[PDB]
Amino acid sequence: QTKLYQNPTTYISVGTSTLNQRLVPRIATRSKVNGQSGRMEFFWTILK
Amino acid sequence: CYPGDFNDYEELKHLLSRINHFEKIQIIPKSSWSSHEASLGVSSACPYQGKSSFFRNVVWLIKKNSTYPTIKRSYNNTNQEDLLVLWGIHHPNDAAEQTKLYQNPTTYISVGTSTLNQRLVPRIATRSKVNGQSGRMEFFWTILKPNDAINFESNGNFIAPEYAYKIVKKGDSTIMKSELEYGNCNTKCQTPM
């Protein structure tokens, strides 16, 4: 996490009329897919 | 018997609808527990022959000397069957019991298969007293595909597996909800009455 983003503690906060979200990245030891370990979890929404 | 909840309980029982036979295998020996104390995870909430005792296919790890060093253990399903494996977190009744049992102010659990990304945080809180106790155990589960590893890591409040469950015979069944006990007959049709 230092390598890539500096800040130790981190978040994401996406906000609209309805949506009120705030995300926190979970560090965890986990098995390797596609020469890769860390995961990326995507989200979505329909902006009226 | 020690109160709490079973996360995604019904989704499991339904999955148990298709299984005709288990085989319990040992994934983490109780003996092999390192620099913790596996022996003293018992509670009067769960009595066995007059003494205090606990669940049998998990183990309720307590701190050693006066420390709880970060757990970092794994297991590869080199069997050729799907593996059902259950763990659990403890939720304490206060900060007093937090240090008293597990040692540390803040704790987390981190299990991770090839498709699991869990990070669990116990919740302290006041609550009404069930079966003597008012802390809670919240249990969890997953299925492990062949040749998949599953890596745990936690610095407290962690109820670890000893035994997992091999799905041997897969097929048809239901979790039938009758109150009659067996009558040594044989049929081709069964109904709860």
Ligand SMILES: *[C@@H]1O[C@H](CO)[C@@H](O[C@@H]2O[C@H](CO)[C@@H](O[C@@H]3O[C@H](CO)[C@@H](O)[C@H](O)[C@@H]3O)[C@H](O)[C@H]2NC(C)=O)[C@H](O)[C@H]1NC(C)=O
């Ligand atoms: C858990 O144990 C299983 C069983 O040993 C491990 O699976 C095996 O992993 C090896 C590599 O370490 C696989 O070999 C690979 O084969 C491909 C194509 O043939 C080759 O190009 C690669 O260089 C690699 O050597 C092997 O097939 C695989 N066994 C099977 C049948 O699944 C596994 O590594 C462990 N679990 C994990 C990945 O966490």
